[PDB]
Amino acid sequence: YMSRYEEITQQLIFSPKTWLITGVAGFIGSNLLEKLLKLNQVVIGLDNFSTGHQYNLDEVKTLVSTEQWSRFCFIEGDIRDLTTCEQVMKGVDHVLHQAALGSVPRSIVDPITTNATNITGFLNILHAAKNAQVQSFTYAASSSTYGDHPALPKVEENIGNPLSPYAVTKYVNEIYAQVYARTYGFKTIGLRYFNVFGRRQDPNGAYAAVIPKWTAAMLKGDDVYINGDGETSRDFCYIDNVIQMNILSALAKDSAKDNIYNVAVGDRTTLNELSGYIYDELNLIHHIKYREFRSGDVRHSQADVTKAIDLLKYRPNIKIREGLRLSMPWYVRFLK
Amino acid sequence: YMSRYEEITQQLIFSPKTWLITGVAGFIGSNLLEKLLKLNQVVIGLDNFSTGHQYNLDEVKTLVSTEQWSRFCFIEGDIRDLTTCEQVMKGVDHVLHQAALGSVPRSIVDPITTNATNITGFLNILHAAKNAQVQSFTYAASSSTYGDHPALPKVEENIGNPLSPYAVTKYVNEIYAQVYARTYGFKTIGLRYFNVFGRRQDPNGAYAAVIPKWTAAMLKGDDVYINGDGETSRDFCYIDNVIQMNILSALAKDSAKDNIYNVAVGDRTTLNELSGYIYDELNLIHHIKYREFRSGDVRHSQADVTKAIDLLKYRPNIKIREGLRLSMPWYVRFLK
Ligand SMILES: NC(=O)c1ccc[n+]([C@@H]2O[C@H](COP(=O)([O-])OP(=O)(O)OC[C@H]3O[C@@H](n4cnc5c(N)ncnc54)[C@H](O)[C@@H]3O)[C@@H](O)[C@H]2O)c1
Ligand SMILES: NC(=O)c1ccc[n+]([C@@H]2O[C@H](COP(=O)([O-])OP(=O)(O)OC[C@H]3O[C@@H](n4cnc5c(N)ncnc54)[C@H](O)[C@@H]3O)[C@@H](O)[C@H]2O)c1
Ligand code: NA
Ligand code: NA
Ligand code: NA
């Protein structure tokens, strides 16, 4: 029972607002789109189709009614262009900012465009939101911000030194957001996601995340790599948790704003057993090598979601195994 | 003496390197130019004349020989364009990055522009320097990185929360510089300047610094406005100490790199006593209203320069009194 979430969705259905989703055509963005349209919200999407796809939008078109779909206005555009940011903020109530170029190895290899997309793009959106006087601003942050902090589980107040240009950019999102609260009174929420997964996460590409990648390899009879000793642990978080948390943040009471929240489940799953988990779930629908560690890959990761539970009355309902069961069928249809 | 600093400056006269100065037309960049041409160095210049002036260059030209000027290649251009940053980096040995939009209140009214110049612009130069494989990289940091931390005098490893968009940019300069060391092995030195003053510091404008603003005011017989009770204090730093530190940092040994240093004197001077000093020094070349505190103004500022003294053999040799005595003539020539 997502009891607080249920109640908040009910306000939204009764008094529908206008939402902006940046990165609408990507994994998390499209999932947020799916839910808000089903809640009869008016949605304004912004995407440049860099990592995102037109087929993600086309899928969501088939998952919602006509009346619902007609309340979605899509704008092809770039968060790096401030003018575009201002144009899309007009009459927006709630801002869900997901647009960015993710991936740690990407930022190492092209820190320039990454900086532009993730810092310049963010500030453009943040500033346009302040000037449009939106009612809430919720943006995608990262567990990479913890950096070389050795403590476990990860507690928001305790971070270390950033280990990648990507870690930097997301921390800079946080800092700008705090300073926007200080100097302007503009209270935002930053969601440090931890290893999200689920339908519409891109399995292709040189930057594919481990769950869709491995899934994609098993469905093809390709080799499944484990980068090192296989002992690495991660806090895998199914999108529904992330959707719940964006919407709870969007309508949080004022005192809950200007805050950073871990978005995860609280569990630690080894790569050795993720390799196992996926196999079983895939093989329930009738269808392993080792190499090196990565420069920027931490031995262990696990969140403490106490703060979200307490402040936002957050209720993570889907753990890894059930997430994968809900996810595998999507990849079957998608990869054929 | 300035014996280690004199060791280097004499080494440079005998054996010239190629230097890149960004912000070369501004206050600090143009003083850096004066020194480097006087030591027969080949200097590459970059400036867009945004807060700097062609007259600062023109002035340097009159203080150096024809053959010294001949080795100054000046490029009108913008650090925000990566291509420009790479063109001005070819053949360069030591980078002195001074190009930025300073002032806190500028960044509160227009955070986008300050982000573009101070974060994007900085990263371009860092990135190009990295690629060009330069011998050293030294950049203009800021005492505002201490933020809200209560300690006084200020010590480099202890910092708090950035209190404005400008502070965020300068702190992010430091973070990126530490990340570049980690990810590419490219070791830089960042200089937390504290309230620099001297020749060619713009007395005109909304954001003119206190010393040049008051010196202009007393020569014109305009009002000297003291914001507050006048017990507000600062570590006023004469340019030669900044120049000194930049050259020390450019030719610093490997282990002294990837470090942040306070550039100041270690002293505290109140606006009250300061107005006394300015006035007294100006009367030897023969020629006040209190008001509401600047909002969010730092109450007291003072650097601990122990790190610079031990690791870079810094000598904070010119205190505020002597500096003002050396700078007063320049403002008389400039305003008549
Ligand atoms: N996926 C995770 O586990 C995870 C972990 C930490 C942080 N995040 C952050 O969550 C957010 C959601 O990303 P995702 O995982 O769905 O990846 P994604 O690539 O599927 O989504 C990113 C979306 O942003 C769009 N976009 C990128 N740059 C843009 C720009 N300049 N202008 C307009 N649109 C732009 C892309 O086209 C894409 O639709 C990102 O900020 C990501 O960094 C995700
Ligand atoms: N003066 C101080 O008390 C103080 C204190 C802390 C930090 N700093 C830093 O020292 C450096 C220089 O300061 P200053 O006092 O000489 O200021 P300044 O305004 O005199 O110098 C800045 C110079 O950079 C140029 N510039 C700005 N944006 C540019 C861009 N995008 N591309 C190319 N050139 C650009 C300006 O036109 C100017 O010539 C800056 O990084 C500043 O933030 C100064
Ligand atoms: Na409104
Ligand atoms: Na509410
Ligand atoms: Na180096």
> With contact defined as beta carbons under 8 Å apart, do B174 and B141 qualify?
yes
CA distance B239 to B234: 15
**Among the residues of B147-291, which ranges form H helices?**
165-184, 210-220, 239-250, 271-283
Quick check: B111 and A127 CB within 8 A? yes
Which residue of B81, B112, B125, B163 is the best one to mutate when testing the A interface, meaning the one whose CB has the most A CBs within 10 A?
B112
Quick check: A172 and B119 CB within 8 A? yes
Which tokens sit at B330?
């320049």
Ligand 1 pocket check: which of A51, A75, A97, A117 to mutate, most ligand atoms within 8 Å of Cβ?
A: A51
* Residue A29 CA, closest ligand 1 atom number: 16
CA distance B88 to B75: 8
CA distance B324 to A66: 74
Which tokens sit at A51?
């990592």
DSSP A221: T
Q: Is any atom of ligand 2 closer than 6 Å to the C-beta of B23?
A: yes
Residue B2 buriedness (CB in 10 A; 0-12 / 13-18 / 19+):
middle
Q: Is any atom of ligand 1 closer than 6 Å to the C-beta of A203?
A: no
Q: Reduced to 3 states, what is the DSSP secondary structure of residue A234?
A: strand
Residue B82 at interface with chain A, using a CB cutoff of 8 Å = yes
Which tokens sit at B301?
């500022």
Of A123, A164, A183, the CB nearest to B108: A183
- The phi and psi torsions of B292 (rounded to 5 degrees) equal -55, 135
Dist. CA A250 → ligand 4 center (Å): 9
Quick check: A168 and B172 CB within 8 A? yes
Residue B131 at interface with chain A, using a CB cutoff of 8 Å = no
C-to-N gaps above 2.5 Å in chain A, after residues: 287
CA distance B59 to A118: 41
How are the residues of chain A apportioned to helix, strand and coil, as percentages rounded to the nearest 5?
Answer: 45, 15, 40
> With contact defined as beta carbons under 8 Å apart, do B259 and B157 qualify?
no
Cα–Cα distance list, B214 to A100, A309, B193, B221, B264 (Å): 46, 55, 21, 10, 21
Look-up: residue for tokens 């505190």?
B293
Which tokens sit at A192?
């440090």
Dist. CA B236 → ligand 1 center (Å): 45
Which tokens sit at A308?
């979200």
Of all ligands present, the nearest one to the C-alpha of A249 is 4
CA distance A84 to A78: 7
**Which residues 6+ apart lie within 8 Å of A173 measured at CB?**
A118, A119, A122, A139, A140, A141, A190
> With contact defined as beta carbons under 8 Å apart, do B262 and B331 qualify?
no
CA distance A331 to A308: 31
Residue B50 at interface with chain A, using a CB cutoff of 8 Å = no
Quick check: A179 and B163 CB within 8 A? yes
> With contact defined as beta carbons under 8 Å apart, do A165 and A112 qualify?
no
Cα–Cα distance list, A282 to A270, A286, A326 (Å): 18, 7, 11
Is it true that the peptide bond before A316 is cis, omega within 30 degrees of 0?
no
**Among the residues of B39-164, which ranges form H helices?**
54-63, 66-69, 82-87, 104-109, 111-115, 121-132
Q: Is any atom of ligand 2 closer than 6 Å to the C-beta of B27?
A: yes
> With contact defined as beta carbons under 8 Å apart, do A101 and A113 qualify?
yes
Q: Degrees (nearest 5) of the Cα angle A65, A69, A73?
A: 175
CA distance B19 to B92: 6
Of all ligands present, the nearest one to the C-alpha of A118 is 1
Look-up: residue for tokens 């054996």?
B15
HSE (side-chain half, CA atoms, 13 Å) at B148 = 9
Which among B96, B83, B99, B78 has a CA at the least distance from the CA of B19? B96
Of A108, A127, A168, the CB nearest to B175: A168
Which tokens sit at A238?
């199914």
Look-up: residue for tokens 């300061």?
B274
C-alpha distance from A87 to closest chain B C-alpha (Å): 16
Tally Cβ neighbours within 10 Å of residue A220.
Answer: 10
Residue B183 at interface with chain A, using a CB cutoff of 8 Å = yes
Residue A175 at interface with chain B, using a CB cutoff of 8 Å = yes
Cα–Cα distance list, B92 to A186, B19, B42, B174 (Å): 44, 6, 9, 22
Specify the pairing of strand B94-97 against strand B18-22. Answer: parallel
Q: Is any atom of ligand 1 closer than 6 Å to the C-beta of A323?
A: no
CA distance A198 to A212: 8
Experimental technique of record: X-ray
Dist. CA A18 → ligand 3 center (Å): 10
Quick check: A162 and B168 CB within 8 A? no
CA distance B47 to B50: 8
Q: Is any atom of ligand 2 closer than 6 Å to the C-beta of B74?
A: no
> With contact defined as beta carbons under 8 Å apart, do A16 and A37 qualify?
no
Which residues of chain A does B127 touch, with a Cβ-Cβ cutoff of 8 Å?
111-112
Cα separation of the two ends of chain A: 35
> With contact defined as beta carbons under 8 Å apart, do B234 and B304 qualify?
no
Quick check: B162 and A172 CB within 8 A? no
Which among B245, B260, B246, B88 has a CA at the least distance from the CA of B176? B260
Cα–Cα distance list, A106 to A53, A111, B140 (Å): 19, 8, 28
Which among B148, B141, B152 has a CA at the least distance from the CA of B162? B148
C-alpha distance from A248 to closest chain B C-alpha (Å): 27
Tally Cβ neighbours within 10 Å of residue B46.
Answer: 27
Of B108, B175, B296, the CB nearest to A162: B175
HSE (side-chain half, CA atoms, 13 Å) at A156 = 18
Dist. CA A7 → ligand 4 center (Å): 9
Amino acid identity for residue B139 in this structure: Y
- The phi and psi torsions of B171 (rounded to 5 degrees) equal -70, -40
Quick check: A168 and B183 CB within 8 A? no
Residue A73 at interface with chain B, using a CB cutoff of 8 Å = no
Look-up: residue for tokens 């290893």?
A195
C-alpha distance from B102 to closest chain A C-alpha (Å): 17
Which tokens sit at B232?
């507000």
> With contact defined as beta carbons under 8 Å apart, do B81 and B124 qualify?
yes
C-alpha distance from B51 to closest chain A C-alpha (Å): 22
Dihedral sign, Cα of residue B142, residue B147, residue B150, residue B156: negative
Q: Is any atom of ligand 2 closer than 6 Å to the C-beta of B210?
A: no
Cα–Cα distance list, B153 to B150, B159, B317 (Å): 9, 12, 18
Of A111, A123, A163, the CB nearest to B112: A123
Give the residue from chain B lying closest to A124, CA to CA.
B112
Residue A122 at interface with chain B, using a CB cutoff of 8 Å = no
Specify the pairing of strand B269-270 against strand B233-234. Answer: antiparallel
CA distance B35 to B24: 12
Which among B90, B74, B96, B87 has a CA at the least distance from the CA of B25? B74
Which among A205, A201, A174, A166 has a CA at the least distance from the CA of A295? A166
Dist. CA B17 → ligand 5 center (Å): 16
Q: Is any atom of ligand 1 closer than 6 Å to the C-beta of A47?
A: yes
Look-up: residue for tokens 């130019």?
B33
Cα–Cα distance list, A227 to A32, A213, A276, B47, B116 (Å): 31, 13, 15, 46, 37
Which tokens sit at A90?
């007009």
Ranges assigned E (strand) in chain B: 18-22, 42-47, 72-76, 94-97, 136-142, 189-193, 196-197, 225-227, 233-234, 237-238, 259-263, 269-270, 289-291
Of all ligands present, the nearest one to the C-alpha of B135 is 5
Which among A329, A335, A332, A320 has a CA at the least distance from the CA of A275? A320
Quick check: B120 and A116 CB within 8 A? yes
**Experimental resolution (Å):** 2.6
Element (H, E) at A237: strand A237-238
**Domains of chain B listed by start with CATH number:** 1-193+239-264+304-318 (3.40.50.720), 194-238+265-303+319-336 (3.90.25.10)
